[PDB]
Amino acid sequence: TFIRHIALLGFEKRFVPSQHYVYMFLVKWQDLSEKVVYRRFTEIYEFHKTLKEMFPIEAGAINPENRIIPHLPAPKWFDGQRAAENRQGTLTEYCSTLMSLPTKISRCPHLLDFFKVRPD
Amino acid sequence: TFIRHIALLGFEKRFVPSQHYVYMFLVKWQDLSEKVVYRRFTEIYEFHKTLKEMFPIEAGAINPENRIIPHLPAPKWFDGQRAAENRQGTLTEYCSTLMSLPTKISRCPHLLDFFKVRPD
Amino acid sequence: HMGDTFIRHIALLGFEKRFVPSQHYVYMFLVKWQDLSEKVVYRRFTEIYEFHKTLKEMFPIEAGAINPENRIIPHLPAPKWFDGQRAAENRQGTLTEYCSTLMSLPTKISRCPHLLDFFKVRPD
């Protein structure tokens, strides 16, 4: 099983434990099956850091010119107003580049596992 | 006759036949003339379905790994107060991918026709 | 080789409303340098468009002004195409694509001093 496509659908406000935002991703799997999953920016950023660590060549850690993994701004750079809308635009681009990568990365178990529906 | 570039400019309320949103495309033709056209999301989605059926190979209908036509979430996936915004980001991606495809598809009459200025 | 100083990536972060000297919107870009350092810069759309026009003048071949089919410099809509109450928001998708395409151009262009200068931090 693998993912064919990820579309960023939007965000929603949540309030427990306190006010934050969750980004909604429409995940289409190999069998045309379709699921919406909900992730915080910080969780996505931790996912991205690990992805870079797993793929140093494609991360640009050896020759920076061979980098193909997309850039993702750290949380700190989304300061005040419009943080949700700002991060939404950034993630839409991040997701399309991510899914355009060679299958070595775009189907790695780290990615598949991040975007699988979480337990109730 | 053909399209060099399409840019998504935003969205606006139309009132005919009643209240809805329309997405604005700045269309640049071969002679560098630029025209804005106005299309509702449903109309774009119908364009996208038809394009797929016209191009089974490139749509991934014969062999899924050979697909190059971009993915577009169904209308049902967009609701809530930010539906119009949420579709905006999705359409920016779809279009750029759309005009990067070979001229068999990026210049097919079905596409040209779609982005031509409609009759008054 | 374009010297010891250049940009690896530019990301559009978003926009902010400014009130001085009067009501306008600036766009915030996160600029990553050769040493992987990152700075935020603030630029109004009119400034971006002038930068764009100058870029095209400097590189006629790559701007498709000789041969339209050889164009690699990205397209950018003129300021008059953005108006109404979502003008600020509406320019984002355009600017996001502009930035990524820019940074994928051959170094002769993507690290030309004009571009490098436009995205450097301005004096206080």
Coordinates of C-alpha atoms in Angstrom, one line a residue:
Chain A
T1 CA 0.0 0.0 0.0
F2 CA 1.1 3.5 -0.8
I3 CA -0.1 7.1 -1.2
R4 CA -1.0 8.4 -4.7
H5 CA -1.7 12.0 -3.7
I6 CA -2.1 14.4 -0.7
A7 CA -4.2 17.6 -1.1
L8 CA -4.3 20.2 1.7
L9 CA -7.9 21.0 2.2
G10 CA -7.7 23.8 4.8
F11 CA -7.4 24.2 8.6
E12 CA -9.6 24.3 11.6
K13 CA -9.3 25.9 15.0
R14 CA -9.2 23.6 18.0
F15 CA -9.4 24.6 21.7
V16 CA -8.3 21.6 23.8
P17 CA -5.8 21.7 25.5
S18 CA -5.7 25.4 24.3
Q19 CA -6.3 27.3 21.0
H20 CA -4.4 25.9 18.1
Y21 CA -4.8 24.9 14.4
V22 CA -5.0 21.6 12.7
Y23 CA -4.3 21.2 9.0
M24 CA -6.6 18.8 7.0
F25 CA -5.1 16.5 4.4
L26 CA -7.0 14.5 1.9
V27 CA -4.9 11.3 1.4
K28 CA -5.6 9.2 -1.7
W29 CA -4.2 5.6 -1.5
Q30 CA -3.3 3.1 -4.1
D31 CA -6.8 1.7 -4.3
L32 CA -8.5 5.1 -4.8
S33 CA -9.7 5.0 -1.2
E34 CA -9.7 8.5 0.3
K35 CA -9.2 9.7 3.9
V36 CA -8.9 13.1 5.6
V37 CA -6.3 13.3 8.4
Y38 CA -5.6 16.2 10.8
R39 CA -2.1 17.3 11.8
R40 CA -0.6 20.3 13.7
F41 CA 2.2 22.3 12.1
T42 CA 4.7 21.2 14.8
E43 CA 4.0 17.5 14.1
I44 CA 4.6 18.2 10.4
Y45 CA 7.8 20.0 11.2
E46 CA 9.0 17.1 13.3
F47 CA 8.1 14.7 10.4
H48 CA 10.1 16.9 8.0
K49 CA 13.2 17.0 10.2
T50 CA 13.2 13.2 10.4
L51 CA 12.7 12.9 6.7
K52 CA 15.8 15.1 6.2
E53 CA 17.8 12.9 8.6
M54 CA 16.8 9.7 6.7
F55 CA 17.8 11.1 3.3
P56 CA 21.0 13.3 3.7
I57 CA 21.8 13.3 0.0
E58 CA 18.3 14.4 -1.0
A59 CA 18.2 16.8 2.0
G60 CA 21.3 18.6 0.7
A61 CA 23.5 17.7 3.6
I62 CA 26.4 16.5 1.4
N63 CA 26.3 18.6 -1.8
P64 CA 23.6 21.3 -1.3
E65 CA 23.1 21.3 -5.1
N66 CA 21.7 17.8 -5.0
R67 CA 18.8 18.7 -2.7
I68 CA 15.3 17.7 -3.8
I69 CA 13.4 17.5 -0.5
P70 CA 11.3 20.7 -0.2
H71 CA 12.2 23.5 2.3
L72 CA 9.8 24.1 5.2
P73 CA 10.1 27.2 7.4
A74 CA 10.5 26.5 11.2
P75 CA 7.4 27.3 13.4
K76 CA 9.1 30.4 14.9
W77 CA 8.8 32.2 11.5
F78 CA 5.0 32.2 11.7
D79 CA 4.8 34.9 14.3
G80 CA 1.5 36.5 14.8
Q81 CA -1.4 37.2 12.7
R82 CA -2.5 34.9 10.0
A83 CA -0.3 32.1 11.2
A84 CA -2.9 29.6 10.2
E85 CA -3.5 31.0 6.7
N86 CA 0.3 31.5 6.2
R87 CA 1.1 27.9 7.2
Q88 CA -1.7 26.6 5.0
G89 CA -0.2 28.2 1.8
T90 CA 3.3 26.9 2.7
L91 CA 1.9 23.3 3.3
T92 CA 0.1 23.1 0.0
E93 CA 3.3 23.7 -1.8
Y94 CA 5.3 21.4 0.5
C95 CA 2.8 18.5 -0.1
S96 CA 2.9 18.7 -3.9
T97 CA 6.7 18.8 -4.0
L98 CA 6.9 15.9 -1.5
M99 CA 4.6 13.7 -3.6
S100 CA 6.6 14.5 -6.8
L101 CA 9.8 13.0 -5.2
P102 CA 11.2 9.6 -6.3
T103 CA 9.3 6.7 -4.6
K104 CA 12.3 5.9 -2.4
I105 CA 11.1 9.0 -0.4
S106 CA 7.5 9.5 -1.5
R107 CA 6.6 5.9 -0.5
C108 CA 9.0 5.5 2.5
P109 CA 7.3 4.0 5.6
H110 CA 8.1 7.2 7.6
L111 CA 5.7 9.2 5.2
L112 CA 3.1 6.4 4.8
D113 CA 2.9 6.1 8.6
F114 CA 2.6 9.9 9.2
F115 CA -0.4 10.2 6.9
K116 CA -2.3 7.1 8.1
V117 CA -5.5 7.6 10.0
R118 CA -4.7 7.7 13.7
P119 CA -6.5 5.7 16.4
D120 CA -9.7 7.0 17.9
Chain B
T1 CA -3.6 29.7 -31.3
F2 CA -2.7 28.6 -27.8
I3 CA -2.0 29.5 -24.1
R4 CA 1.5 30.4 -22.9
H5 CA 0.5 31.0 -19.2
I6 CA -2.5 30.9 -16.8
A7 CA -2.4 32.8 -13.4
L8 CA -5.0 32.4 -10.7
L9 CA -5.8 35.9 -9.5
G10 CA -8.4 35.2 -6.8
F11 CA -12.1 34.8 -6.4
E12 CA -15.3 36.9 -6.4
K13 CA -19.0 36.7 -5.8
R14 CA -21.3 36.3 -8.8
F15 CA -25.1 36.5 -8.5
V16 CA -26.3 34.8 -11.6
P17 CA -28.2 32.6 -11.5
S18 CA -27.7 33.4 -7.7
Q19 CA -24.9 33.8 -5.1
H20 CA -21.8 31.8 -5.8
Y21 CA -18.0 32.1 -6.0
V22 CA -16.0 32.3 -9.2
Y23 CA -12.2 31.9 -9.7
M24 CA -10.4 34.3 -11.8
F25 CA -7.8 33.2 -14.4
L26 CA -5.5 35.6 -16.2
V27 CA -5.0 33.9 -19.6
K28 CA -1.9 34.8 -21.7
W29 CA -2.2 33.7 -25.4
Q30 CA 0.5 33.2 -28.1
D31 CA 0.4 36.9 -29.1
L32 CA 0.9 37.9 -25.5
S33 CA -2.6 39.4 -25.2
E34 CA -4.1 38.8 -21.7
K35 CA -7.7 38.2 -20.8
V36 CA -9.4 37.4 -17.5
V37 CA -11.9 34.6 -17.4
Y38 CA -14.3 33.6 -14.6
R39 CA -15.1 29.9 -13.7
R40 CA -16.9 28.3 -10.8
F41 CA -15.4 25.3 -9.1
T42 CA -18.0 22.9 -10.3
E43 CA -17.3 24.0 -13.9
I44 CA -13.6 23.5 -13.5
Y45 CA -14.2 20.0 -12.0
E46 CA -16.4 19.1 -15.0
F47 CA -13.6 20.3 -17.3
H48 CA -11.2 18.1 -15.4
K49 CA -13.4 14.9 -15.6
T50 CA -13.8 15.4 -19.3
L51 CA -10.1 16.0 -19.9
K52 CA -9.4 12.7 -18.1
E53 CA -11.8 10.7 -20.2
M54 CA -10.3 12.3 -23.4
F55 CA -6.8 11.2 -22.3
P56 CA -7.1 7.7 -20.6
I57 CA -3.3 7.0 -20.9
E58 CA -2.2 10.3 -19.4
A59 CA -5.1 10.1 -16.8
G60 CA -3.8 6.8 -15.4
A61 CA -6.8 4.8 -16.6
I62 CA -4.6 2.2 -18.4
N63 CA -1.6 2.1 -16.1
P64 CA -1.8 4.2 -12.8
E65 CA 2.0 4.9 -12.8
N66 CA 1.9 6.7 -16.2
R67 CA -0.4 9.5 -14.9
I68 CA 0.7 13.1 -15.4
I69 CA -2.7 14.9 -15.3
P70 CA -2.9 16.6 -11.9
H71 CA -5.2 15.5 -9.1
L72 CA -8.2 17.7 -8.1
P73 CA -10.4 17.1 -5.1
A74 CA -14.1 16.7 -5.6
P75 CA -16.4 19.7 -4.7
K76 CA -17.8 17.7 -1.7
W77 CA -14.4 18.1 0.0
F78 CA -14.8 21.9 0.4
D79 CA -17.2 23.4 2.9
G80 CA -17.3 25.7 6.0
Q81 CA -16.6 29.4 6.1
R82 CA -13.3 29.1 4.2
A83 CA -14.4 27.0 1.2
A84 CA -13.6 29.7 -1.3
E85 CA -10.1 30.3 0.1
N86 CA -9.4 26.5 0.5
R87 CA -10.2 25.9 -3.2
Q88 CA -8.0 28.9 -4.3
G89 CA -4.8 27.1 -3.1
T90 CA -5.8 23.8 -4.6
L91 CA -6.4 25.5 -8.0
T92 CA -3.1 27.4 -8.1
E93 CA -1.3 24.0 -7.9
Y94 CA -3.6 22.3 -10.4
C95 CA -3.1 25.0 -13.0
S96 CA 0.7 25.2 -12.9
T97 CA 0.8 21.4 -13.3
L98 CA -1.8 21.7 -16.0
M99 CA 0.3 24.0 -18.3
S100 CA 3.6 22.0 -17.7
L101 CA 2.1 18.9 -19.5
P102 CA 3.0 18.0 -23.2
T103 CA 1.2 20.0 -26.0
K104 CA -1.0 17.0 -26.8
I105 CA -3.0 18.1 -23.6
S106 CA -1.8 21.6 -22.6
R107 CA -2.9 22.7 -26.1
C108 CA -5.9 20.5 -26.8
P109 CA -9.0 22.3 -28.0
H110 CA -11.0 21.2 -24.9
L111 CA -8.5 23.2 -22.7
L112 CA -8.2 26.1 -25.1
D113 CA -12.0 26.3 -25.4
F114 CA -12.4 26.2 -21.6
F115 CA -10.2 29.2 -21.0
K116 CA -11.5 31.3 -23.9
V117 CA -13.6 34.4 -23.1
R118 CA -17.3 33.3 -23.1
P119 CA -20.0 35.1 -25.1
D120 CA -21.7 38.0 -23.4
Chain C
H1 CA 30.3 30.5 -10.2
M2 CA 28.6 33.7 -9.0
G3 CA 30.9 34.5 -6.0
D4 CA 30.8 33.6 -2.4
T5 CA 27.4 35.1 -1.6
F6 CA 24.1 33.9 -2.9
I7 CA 20.5 32.7 -2.1
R8 CA 19.5 29.1 -1.9
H9 CA 15.8 29.5 -1.2
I10 CA 13.1 32.1 -0.9
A11 CA 9.7 31.3 0.7
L12 CA 6.7 33.6 0.9
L13 CA 5.6 33.6 4.5
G14 CA 2.6 35.9 4.1
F15 CA 1.7 39.6 4.3
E16 CA 1.3 42.4 6.8
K17 CA -0.7 45.6 6.9
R18 CA 1.3 48.8 7.4
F19 CA -0.1 52.2 8.3
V20 CA 3.0 54.4 7.8
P21 CA 3.3 56.4 5.6
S22 CA -0.3 55.3 4.8
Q23 CA -2.4 52.0 4.4
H24 CA -0.5 49.4 2.3
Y25 CA 0.5 45.7 2.4
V26 CA 4.0 44.3 2.4
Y27 CA 4.9 40.6 1.6
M28 CA 7.2 38.8 3.9
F29 CA 9.9 36.5 2.4
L30 CA 12.1 34.1 4.2
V31 CA 15.5 34.2 2.4
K32 CA 18.0 31.4 3.0
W33 CA 21.6 32.3 2.2
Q34 CA 24.6 30.3 1.1
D35 CA 25.7 29.6 4.7
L36 CA 22.1 28.4 5.4
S37 CA 21.4 31.6 7.5
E38 CA 17.8 32.9 7.1
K39 CA 16.4 36.5 7.3
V40 CA 12.9 37.9 6.7
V41 CA 12.5 40.8 4.2
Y42 CA 9.4 42.9 3.6
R43 CA 8.5 44.1 0.1
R44 CA 5.5 45.8 -1.4
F45 CA 4.1 44.4 -4.7
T46 CA 5.0 47.5 -6.7
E47 CA 8.6 46.9 -5.7
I48 CA 8.4 43.3 -6.7
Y49 CA 7.0 44.2 -10.1
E50 CA 9.7 46.8 -10.8
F51 CA 12.3 44.1 -9.8
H52 CA 10.6 41.7 -12.2
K53 CA 10.6 44.3 -15.1
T54 CA 14.3 45.0 -14.6
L55 CA 15.0 41.3 -14.5
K56 CA 13.4 40.8 -17.9
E57 CA 15.3 43.8 -19.4
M58 CA 18.7 42.4 -18.3
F59 CA 18.1 38.9 -19.8
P60 CA 16.1 39.4 -23.1
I61 CA 16.8 35.8 -24.4
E62 CA 15.6 34.1 -21.2
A63 CA 12.6 36.5 -21.0
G64 CA 11.4 35.3 -24.5
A65 CA 11.5 38.8 -26.0
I66 CA 13.6 37.5 -28.9
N67 CA 12.0 34.1 -29.2
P68 CA 8.8 33.6 -27.2
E69 CA 9.3 29.8 -27.1
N70 CA 12.7 30.1 -25.3
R71 CA 11.2 31.9 -22.3
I72 CA 12.2 30.6 -18.8
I73 CA 11.8 33.7 -16.7
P74 CA 8.5 33.3 -14.7
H75 CA 5.4 35.4 -15.5
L76 CA 4.1 37.9 -13.1
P77 CA 0.7 39.8 -13.4
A78 CA 0.8 43.6 -13.5
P79 CA -0.4 45.4 -10.4
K80 CA -3.6 46.5 -12.1
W81 CA -4.9 42.9 -12.0
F82 CA -5.2 42.9 -8.2
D83 CA -7.9 45.1 -6.6
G84 CA -10.8 44.8 -4.2
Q85 CA -10.8 43.8 -0.5
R86 CA -8.8 40.5 -1.0
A87 CA -6.0 42.1 -3.1
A88 CA -3.4 41.3 -0.4
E89 CA -4.4 37.7 -0.2
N90 CA -4.9 37.3 -3.9
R91 CA -1.3 38.0 -4.8
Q92 CA 0.1 35.1 -2.7
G93 CA -0.4 32.2 -5.1
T94 CA 1.2 34.3 -7.8
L95 CA 4.2 35.2 -5.6
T96 CA 4.7 31.7 -4.2
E97 CA 5.0 30.4 -7.8
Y98 CA 7.2 33.3 -8.8
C99 CA 9.7 32.6 -6.0
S100 CA 10.1 28.9 -6.7
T101 CA 10.5 29.3 -10.4
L102 CA 13.0 32.1 -9.8
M103 CA 15.2 29.9 -7.6
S104 CA 15.1 27.1 -10.3
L105 CA 16.7 29.3 -13.0
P106 CA 20.3 29.0 -14.1
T107 CA 22.7 30.7 -11.7
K108 CA 23.5 33.4 -14.3
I109 CA 20.0 34.7 -13.4
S110 CA 19.1 33.1 -9.9
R111 CA 22.2 34.5 -8.3
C112 CA 22.6 37.8 -10.4
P113 CA 23.5 40.8 -8.2
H114 CA 20.2 42.5 -9.0
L115 CA 18.2 39.7 -7.5
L116 CA 20.6 39.2 -4.6
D117 CA 20.3 42.9 -3.8
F118 CA 16.6 43.1 -4.0
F119 CA 16.3 40.3 -1.3
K120 CA 19.1 41.6 1.1
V121 CA 18.0 43.2 4.4
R122 CA 17.5 46.9 4.0
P123 CA 19.1 49.5 6.2
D124 CA 17.3 50.6 9.4

